[PDB]
Each structure stands twice: as C-alpha cells, then as structure tokens.
Amino acid sequence: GGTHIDLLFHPPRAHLLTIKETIRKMIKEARKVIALVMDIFTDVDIFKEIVEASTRGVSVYILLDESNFNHFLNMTEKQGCSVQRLRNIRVRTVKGQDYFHGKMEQKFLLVDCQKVMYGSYSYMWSFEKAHLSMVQIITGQLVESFDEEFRTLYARSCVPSSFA
C-alpha cells in the first residue's frame, strides 16, 4: 500500500510523451470517473477528450476557479458544445476569500481513483507552447488524499451563475 511518483516536464526531459499527450492518454483511458480541478481551462483538445470520455459513460466532475470561469465558458461556446446539456459532466466553480478576487490556486487531474496528475500545468495553449512546467504522475495510496481533497473542494463549490 505504497505510492509511486514519476515526474514529467515541459519541455520533456527523459520521457517520451509531453504533459499534454499524457493528459489526453489519461482521459482516453478513463473507465469510470474523471475529477478535474483547474485554474484556467481553454485547451480545446483536452476539452474534446473529456467530452468524448463522457459519451463513453465516464462521469466527469470539473471544478474551475470562479474568476477565470468565463474563459472556459467562451471556449465551450466557440466549440458549439454547451456543457450544461452534456449529461455525464458537472461543472462547478470554487473561489478563495476576496479583498481583487481570492482564487482556487490548485490543480490536478484524478482518473478512476487510480492515477493523479498533479503540478503546474494549466489547460491552456500557453502551457503547450510558451511556459515551462512540471507535473507528477501519482499512483497508490496518496491518490486517496486527492480523492478526499476533491470532495472537500466540491463541497465548497457553487453552480456557475450562467447555469439555470
């Protein structure tokens, strides 16, 4: 009942896949659940993979930082893919304490209660093309702590204003 961690980098260092490819593979291989916490979500390829998972019957829960939520909504609209009407996906927002918006500065992807990607990669074109980042691929016991954190966040999340 241990934990295993591999590191991945952007740009890649001593591994065959990029972080984006690894994200898409994790989502592609999802069998049951995807739980995503993300600060900014505008990457169309990743969104497509998630939409496709939900059509296979995977339950998708997404928590987005409230202050950047409009960027995700804009992307979903551009793609003609209204997220409210997709039945296997629920999207809710999370914020911090305001003073200037307090933000949810956490991100991670958890698939099938089995594997977590945790790190500094945000789901935006800029992270594929411009920024340096790193993530961990986590399996084993520590995944349970990410499950618990997701549940904690989900409990403090709100329905986005737009959804009625």
Ligand X SMILES: Cc1nnc(Nc2cccc(F)c2)s1
Among 104, 110, 111, 143, binds a copy of itself (CB under 8 A): 104
Round to whole Å and give the CA distance between 26 and 117: 9
Q: Build a one-symbol-per-residue string for 132-161: x at contacts with ligand X by CB under 6 A, - elsewhere.
A: ---------------x--xx--x-------
Cα 61 to its chain centre, rounded Å, is 9
DSSP 13: -
By a kind-dependent CB cut-off of 5 to 8 A, residue 122 interacts, out of a copy of itself, ligand X, none, with a copy of itself
Q: Residue 99 binds what, of a copy of itself, ligand X, none (CB under 5 to 8 Å, by partner type)? A: a copy of itself
39: phi then psi, degrees, rounded to nearest 5? -80, -45
Does 145 engage in binding with a copy of itself (CB under 8 A)? Answer: yes
146 contacts: CB under 8 Å, gap ≥ 6: 108, 110, 116, 118, 138
74: contact with a copy of itself by CB under 8 A: no
Q: Please report whether residue 147 would count as binding a copy of itself according to CB under 8 A.
A: no
Please state, in angstroms and rounded to a whole number, the distance separating the CA atoms of residues 11 and 99.
36
User: Where do contacts with ligand X occur on this chain (CB under 6 A)?
Assistant: 33, 35, 61, 110, 113, 147, 150-151, 154
